[PDB]
Symmetry: C2
Subunit: 292 residues, 2 copies
Amino acid sequence: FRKMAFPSGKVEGCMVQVTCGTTTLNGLWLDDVVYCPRHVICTSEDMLNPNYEDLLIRKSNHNFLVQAGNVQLRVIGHSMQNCVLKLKVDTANPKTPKYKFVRIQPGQTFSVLACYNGSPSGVYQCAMRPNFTIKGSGSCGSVGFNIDYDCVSFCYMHHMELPTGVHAGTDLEGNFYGPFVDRQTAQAAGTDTTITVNVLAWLYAAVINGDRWFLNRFTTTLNDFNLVAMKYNYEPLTQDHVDILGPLSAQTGIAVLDMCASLKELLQNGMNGRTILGSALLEDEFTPFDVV
Amino acid sequence: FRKMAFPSGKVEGCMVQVTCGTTTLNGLWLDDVVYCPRHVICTSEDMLNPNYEDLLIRKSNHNFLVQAGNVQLRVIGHSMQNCVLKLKVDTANPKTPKYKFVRIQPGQTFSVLACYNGSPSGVYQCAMRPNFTIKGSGSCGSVGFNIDYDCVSFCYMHHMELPTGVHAGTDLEGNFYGPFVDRQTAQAAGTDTTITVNVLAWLYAAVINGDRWFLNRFTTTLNDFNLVAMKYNYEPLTQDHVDILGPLSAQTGIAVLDMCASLKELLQNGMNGRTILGSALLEDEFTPFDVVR
């Protein structure tokens, strides 16, 4: 059961390199706008406490250099939307896919096209952590996305590396995920928790595959499970979570609070050297949708 | 440290659907040739004892329906090279990247673009296991590749699922990896082993990152290392492997056999609740080449 990323070609055709002063990072070119982190207009000195409103009024179009591979794109206007800079350019991207800007929730998954100075280098599948960071792997301005039948839903743009080595960023409308700011200040990820509904989805995946040994005869209650969950650093499970797992309960004949009893037992006794779909640690970066 | 796949766009533009009879699977459209598994010409019955030469002589060009998106491609010739069918079409793929065909060895990594009826649906990063199978995820004719400086090295095409759930396939000259055949027999993957040289390159990546809780003050001989490691189903480490890790030893000041000693202790002790880039497992699908980059 591999973690799979979406095919990245539709996004690859949108990556460009944006340079302002000595700073170069990645930008997203859709029709005649290039989107990138606003902190590209920031000198290392400004990043300690910048006034973005005033730093950009002092900038003009000639301060921005946009490169789509070989071709330089001419900037003809610039604007900010929250923490994303919007550079209007004189050429519409002919490779623009059908797309939407969406904002995702903690625990949802997406693919990231990691890029270096407008040159895409690799693609990987993530989950947005409950503490709103991304455990991932210069790359600023790289984006996250899902694809639904020819439509690319952009959900993430990379802005910052946090001192624990995780990543922080915004949606494509410049709204941060998590209590972070685009400033060179002290900031840290909160204590993270495991995404319970994803673990349950992944256990249903093991039952759809031929692995049943963690199933037991018992049930538990939503409240009783949550007390075990909170004691083991796990997101609390909601009646909505139970509802999303409904399809996998109908398919496998394992009710959700039955699977919850299984998980509760695994959290207290381990696997005794057994494995679930190959692994011996519990996977939480597959959503119920991903498993279906 | 994420296991990353190559950006798949250059390969997406080469995926097509090949239909023969009631069988549809994926093909690879490069210049004016479509490559696909030759068992596309087999019925379910034929797969027990397929005589491919006999099955193929009875086909004409128009028995093969090739679809590239909305466009039907006209097949104008066909031939068989080992276990891959090569369909000559009347149109060169305008999206053909710079490419070559390479055959890989166990331990080598690559990306797989998993496709269904010519439609790419996901990309994942792979290693060829020592037993010549893939622990991967209607996929037949999906391909594995590496990308180096805008040139796509195709190394794998998917043909068969083995009863344990793993995958068997060929290079792009149609030669199977391992002892497997495109026939429904009792073949099974041999006991798999861990790719030792990849674990060590990864441990070197951990030290370079700044992680070294797992080091110790011991060394080992190469032979003592292998005697112990093979008790955990680890591949033997060769002098070639030692030579390969040389640049990482030089960069971290940690001799290869000293890292070998650490691995021996890691196998004996486990992780004790700790992690190594991240990670809760001894990871063996990053090559030394991968680690430098």
